[PDB]
Amino acid sequence: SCVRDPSNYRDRSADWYAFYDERRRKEIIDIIDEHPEIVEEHAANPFGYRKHPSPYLQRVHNYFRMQPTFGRYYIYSEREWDAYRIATIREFGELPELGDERFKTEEEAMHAVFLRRIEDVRAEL
Amino acid sequence: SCVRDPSNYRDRSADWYAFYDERRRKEIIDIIDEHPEIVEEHAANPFGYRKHPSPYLQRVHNYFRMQPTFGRYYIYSEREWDAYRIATIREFGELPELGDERFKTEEEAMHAVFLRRIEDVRAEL
Amino acid sequence: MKDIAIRGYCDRPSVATGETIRFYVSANETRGTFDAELVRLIHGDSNPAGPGYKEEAIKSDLEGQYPARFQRTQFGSYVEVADPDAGLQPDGAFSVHLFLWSTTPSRGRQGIASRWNDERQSGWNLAIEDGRVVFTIGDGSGATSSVVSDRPLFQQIWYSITGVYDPEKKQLRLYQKSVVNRTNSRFGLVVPLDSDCAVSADATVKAADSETSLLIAGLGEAAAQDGRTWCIAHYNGKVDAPKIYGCALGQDDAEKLSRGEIVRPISRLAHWDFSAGIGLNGIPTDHVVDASGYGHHGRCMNQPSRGSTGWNWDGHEENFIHCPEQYGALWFHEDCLDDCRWEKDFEFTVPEGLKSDFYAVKIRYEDTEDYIPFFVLPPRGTATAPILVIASTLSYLAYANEQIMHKADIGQAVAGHTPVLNENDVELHKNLSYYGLSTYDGHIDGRGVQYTSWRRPIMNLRPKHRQGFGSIWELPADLHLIDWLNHNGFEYDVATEHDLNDQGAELLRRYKVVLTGSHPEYQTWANADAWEDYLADGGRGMYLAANGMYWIVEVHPEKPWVMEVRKELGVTAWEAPPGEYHYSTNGRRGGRFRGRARATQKIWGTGMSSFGFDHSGYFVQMPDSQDERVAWIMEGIDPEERIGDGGLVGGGAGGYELDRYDLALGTPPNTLLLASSVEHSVVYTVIPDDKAFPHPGMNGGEHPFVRADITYFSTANGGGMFATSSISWLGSLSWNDYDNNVSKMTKNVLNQFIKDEPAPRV
Amino acid sequence: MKDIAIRGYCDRPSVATGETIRFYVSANETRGTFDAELVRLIHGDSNPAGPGYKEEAIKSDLEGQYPARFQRTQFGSYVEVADPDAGLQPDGAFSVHLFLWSTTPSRGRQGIASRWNDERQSGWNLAIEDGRVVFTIGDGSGATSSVVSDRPLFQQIWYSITGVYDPEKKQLRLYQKSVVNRTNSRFGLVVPLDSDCAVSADATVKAADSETSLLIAGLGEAAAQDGRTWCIAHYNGKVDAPKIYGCALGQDDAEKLSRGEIVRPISRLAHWDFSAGIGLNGIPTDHVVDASGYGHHGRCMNQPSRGSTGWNWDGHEENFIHCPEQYGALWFHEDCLDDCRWEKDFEFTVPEGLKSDFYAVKIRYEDTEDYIPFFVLPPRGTATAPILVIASTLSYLAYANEQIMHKADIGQAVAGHTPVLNENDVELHKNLSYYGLSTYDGHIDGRGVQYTSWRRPIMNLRPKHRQGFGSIWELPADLHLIDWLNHNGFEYDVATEHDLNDQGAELLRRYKVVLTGSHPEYQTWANADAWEDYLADGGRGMYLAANGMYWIVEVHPEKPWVMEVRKELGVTAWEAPPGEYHYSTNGRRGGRFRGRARATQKIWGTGMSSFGFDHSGYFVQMPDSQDERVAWIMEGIDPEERIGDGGLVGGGAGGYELDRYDLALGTPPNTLLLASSVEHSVVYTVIPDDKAFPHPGMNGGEHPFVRADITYFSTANGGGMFATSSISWLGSLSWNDYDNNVSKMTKNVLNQFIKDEPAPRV
Ligand SMILES: [Fe+3]
Ligand SMILES: [Fe+3]
């Protein structure tokens, strides 16, 4: 009758997700700006071990930690307990992109990924 | 062989929940003291309408709002839009225990429950 | 504080022109007269920010005065077996055997099986008294003889019980053996259980004719005059395969009976197979077969849970229709109620000129008033308007006499504020046995209430009722649409979801457009088919709600006033029993529509997304807004405006519950997404399903699933489907004296759908 | 940047004295040699706070040098029919018909059904090319003739496809017809679907014998060598009732075929009923019956999902064993793998004096090393120690080659920190076709992986592996216990969960005590029965984990190396198809153990409560810890001391996953609660079930469910059960150089259980 070619139709929820993510990115950069102490809080104890994250630090974590895996950061163990790097997930069959610097501990690399995910969003605004 | 009379065997998860409620009550009162601004924040807008509760106020709500029904408070509409009272839930087949003061709006009655609930946890310490 | 003094109900939800509807009323004391009149319901919300309450008085044959009597209500479920010939009261030896599964062993005196007259203390009963099984017989002089168990019952353990009266030995004997397997009881074979015993006591009295009915899960109150044996001392739990023997059984016979053997079969006087009647369409009946061949058939009363795990259930098969021999149990609850069984006070035959619409019988009696709502159809097989409003009567039943804020601990947390209740709620808690429970409350057992009846006073059905989620709920909240339709002068018929279920798509096809209530959560499979077939062939719909068509529901074929629903998950902390997910009234799996490849998106365009009740949000227009194909939806609305910032339900047009666009769940490809909602707090929650596994931040403002999507798609032959995807949509229609975006949009669509031209294509 | 250059696997997880285990290796290219060696595993955690990596070389008949070769791995699931005599390449006219449900319609060239040699472009194939169904023939000259569909396939919509080669008309024909009903397809009857077409094209070549196997869900790559036909261009989605006729069909026949009729049955050359074989025990076979009666039987390769919804599935029955006629579909995935099918490089037969233990074959090749872990049992029918440690090999299979952090959006949210991955996680992502997926990942077409096989290199099995949740995970984590055992002089045996499923309670009964791994998440029903029976009759257990016995799992009776599991819910956003919950290998319902009335509390004393991985907490003692009855457990442990502050797994003895005490779920009444864990962040999450309905605050530090309970209960015949209820329990054993409360507590219990005397009563 009327619905013929599947390529004439797009998942129109992407319109919403693009707006939510834009509105939601601004919400995160503003939280960082008005509570700059959380960057120190994270660098001192990125695991929250025995000092749980603050509510505003947790709110930031909740956005970064739930992003799509493609283009996402993980930490790559080059030599465990000596050298860690920041990997970027690329398509299946590809190797990750490795950041240049090496970090000596897991905690140090976690904070580097935190700082970079923040710089990445500032760029998109 | 050994397990014979059902009254010899209490539900020992009550020992945990007693310890949990104690630690959790102290946590709340020390949240209210460390952030006294949240008592005013609730008075001004208990529904959070257009000004969502701050993270520390929500943590207090999360405790109060999940409490066992028996002995808990609700808001009785004595004369709707004119007089509201603080009702205390009792066993089935019983009237609720009713507070004395009457309130002109539900917003006022909701903050009255908030303050009384704080007063109640203080008294248990 | 103040006292509800009278309450009533009616026998059915809807009547067409020329048909009769009966009304039943009960006052606190039999004394005086009450007044009744007919009213057309218009607006229930008294919210001063809104247009206030509104009704219209209708001259009717029923208006007048009536004797005000108190009608005692038989509470609790059980099985009744008529025995006017005293066949089940032997004058010699006899024995009783059954399997039981007690869920409230310490909750007072409970009759497991009896032919007993409690007033005279005559007959015989097997009962739980002080947490122990007890076999008792009386002669009517007040004296009785009892044998009491050595081992108190463990909660939710299966036991085999054999009570024996051996007159040749002037002896009473009781045999108790536990029969737990890997899968039928609270705990398993690891615990070294010792709840077995065989005791005897002296029998000093003979068992006399109780002149009552034999009962399972209760005791006869007194001499059954009028043929009605009032049932008291209710049992909570399961009974499986109760039987009566006409001789005195011994130890080895109890041993064999505990392993499922039907010892000395010809000696049986009666033997009730609760599984007899299970077929591929379930066991949709209250009938109970007498497997002894002696004609002592039973009748289920107040709808106990049929299709329930039996003593021999081992877990290899979970659908009762495929293994009847392991589903021979009935689960009884002291707080069941499928019919108040009152005596009618007055009726009403719908006269000719009476418009199809929302109606109610207004009852005045002293310092109180009560409304008995019902619905008037157009003459059978006809339509009297172009618009059809579907009254969500199936959902009204699901929430019937809800006591969430009294039973659910997390009730207030889900509400996002302390709940504001009223006299109708205080009344449910004080006189529970006049009203019964909803499918959201748990039985005292802790099992979800899976049956809900229309033949009871449903207090949250009254138009002036306010509900604990923050404003109003279901029927009163649906009057938000009734008022808006009347205020704009639209002409409309009405029908119930019960009527849709009966007439199928043939009913919808009489209307250019069909409107939904504010929350059509519960629907039959036939209803889904009716919408699907109606829209596929030029029908035009308006899904002005959210969470619609979420739960598959069924109407009891024997008791059209009863609805069955079995939920995997509910507010109150009631256990969903492992092997009992299939509906007794049709044997189908039921449950979530989404789980049967029939998600709300497949039919109306959007589906359950999230819920939260602290307050409502508003819609911001999306890129499809400025599309010309839907210029007609947007005509009077500015591309920069918010939509629905303000309302009577939480202060916003998008709130309470939100449905979303989703291709994977069945949204038609040519759907356009006009606007989404914002300003939802952490109070808005997400039900974890296979697309949303639980993690931190699965709440409003932190997860992209928490929003409502206003959608539209065209169908073949000039049809079309418009959806707003928010429960609180209708609550925003009257804002600022009907001058707002929520009114403009709804009017634009409606005006377009009732035109004599195809709904715009895409 | 680092390059894993070689990998291997063994044919079975466990071997006893006298039995033979085969090893398979594949180097990146064929050159040089690798060294093989046998080592006993002891400790794999290189964490510097702990004792570091430990192993021991054992002399074995297998050590030596071996030629290193690359072994091609056949990837993706499909059906293969042997046809040496070219019966399915009829010399004359012929037609192909099937039902189709494409999940990746646009994912490049995919073969639906073929007898086709791609190197010579000979034979015939039905394929998706450019998003359209294409029927192609070839003569081996490189030229081909194609007829291309007019309507591109819609994703997850059911189509009836008919391909016709008509040499009389020198014509190819294609009949595409959409057969969507209310319940079988992505969307429903509302959408006006124009996706039907009949197209013809000229036939300018004869169809030649391709000298390959006939395939469903793929194309033959080249002329079969030695009988192996390689399958390329893997199709994703379902196929139903594919059949081949020995004549050309017309519009009429394709019409009837699309409605289910079996037109001209006498002319069928072959017809595959994928549902033939379904019984009450399911369909535990790869066999595919040729219902035409011609003997052209096929064989499933790489375990496509059997017992799957067909084109005619209407939703009345959801269990394939009770309606096979509606479950005639196979679900194919390009990333299925049940067997690498490599050629063995060497083998090993357990000699007499080899202790039962954790073992691996260590492989050195250039500057890489790999470990092929397996397990050695005592001589059949005997035990060689008083302690038995169960290797959680069912759970190893479930997490086999997990790639959560690469595929799950919320992977890091669940973890509570950016995950730390290693060389093994990079290899999985570059060369997925060598390794395959776990049950925690999704298939490329967004459906859960329900089969997992041991006959593949499983990288997270290697001891030096570290997993993204924070430290180590399964087998490496279990080596924490293996190190504590060997360090403290305990003599122990080892058996896999696969062995428990084989031998039953007879195996457990040979030991005074049986120890659990760190995470026995996956168990067979027979494993439950064995634990229950063992513990009920004097056995003694130590549940040193959490989330144990959560998922019901089945071992493929035809392929003991495959395990099946179907889950309602997973971290990856994969769908759980509506009518496909029942297991194809036994027909039972499977799923959560709690859902079949066998909650873990019923057997081990505690059951799943929550999970979270940012770090672990410690245990604070409870009142039952100072009960004199358990003084033997609390030896050198002061009542004020914290238990387990510090550890190699999140820094605490209680975290990662937490189990709790719950009477309602089966905890024995006589259970004592010695301690509960604290210090859990909001990262710790609760899974919504009937006990806890989702609401704000359902997370660590805010809900009383989020804790771990240390319990003990006695059983008959001097048995008893001890649970620590925390995955990270074994991670704290080695803390502070083995001087900690978690070591003393575990030792206290272990020394008591291995005593020739009854576990303390209660
Ligand atoms: Fe609901
Ligand atoms: Fe898991």
Numbering used by the authors:
A (entry chain B), B (entry chain D): 7 to 131
C (entry chain C), D (entry chain A): 1 to 762
Copy out sentences from the published article reporting this entry, exactly as the authors wrote them.
The active site consists of a mononuclear iron coordinated by two Tyr side‐chain phenolates and one carboxylate from Glu.
The mononuclear Fe atom is tetra‐coordinated with the protein. It is coordinated to two phenolates of tyrosine residues (Y399 and Y440 serve as monodentate ligands), and a glutamic acid carboxylate side chain (E521 serves as a bidentate ligand).
